């Protein structure tokens, strides 16, 4: 339902976020421009998604509504839950950041909200 593959097409407030959080500036810098995809294979609550950013390969994991592991950004795992609020709408809150990632038709959109910082990224399914 969420299942498929997508690449980012734009963002907003990259650096911002990523300073805030603690990425090293090295990967931020080598990061900022770079078009992400994700694949996510949902299977009932059960969601397996990959995250690839260059090299950077971060997959995770979970069932909504139960704890789960994530590993963020930074390689810091968190344990957290992951709710539905509708069938297309998966909302988390780790590390002071709430999470909220929507998908429209082909187009998915994942907002991370830390302070009055607002990360947003917009995805449109590929393969
Ligand atoms: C590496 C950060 C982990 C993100 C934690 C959000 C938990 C639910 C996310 C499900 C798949 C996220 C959708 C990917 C879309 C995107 O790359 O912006």
């Known amino acids: 339902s969420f299942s498929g593959k997508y690449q980012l097409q734009s963002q907003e407030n990259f650096e911002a ?4 959080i ?3 500036e090295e990967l931020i810098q080598k990061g900022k ?3 992400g995809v994700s694949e996510i294979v949902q299977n009932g609550k059960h969601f397996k998604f990959t995250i690839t950013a260059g090299s950077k390969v971060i997959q995770n994991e979970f ?3 139960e704890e789960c592991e994530l590993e963020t950004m930074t ?7 992951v709710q539905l609020e509708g069938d297309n709408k998966l909302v ?3 590390k002071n950041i709430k999470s909220v990632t929507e998908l429209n038709g082909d187009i998915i959109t994942n907002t991370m909200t830390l ?3 607002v990360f947003k990224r917009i995805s449109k399914r590929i393969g």
């Open 33 to 35: 421009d770079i078009k």
């Open 22 to 24: 603690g990425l090293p």
């Open 63 to 65: 069932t909504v509504g």
């Open 92 to 94: 988390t809150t780790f």
């Open 75 to 81: 390689g810091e795992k968190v344990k957290t839950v």
């Open 115 to 117: 302070g009055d910082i």
């Open 17 to 20: 976020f990523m300073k805030a």
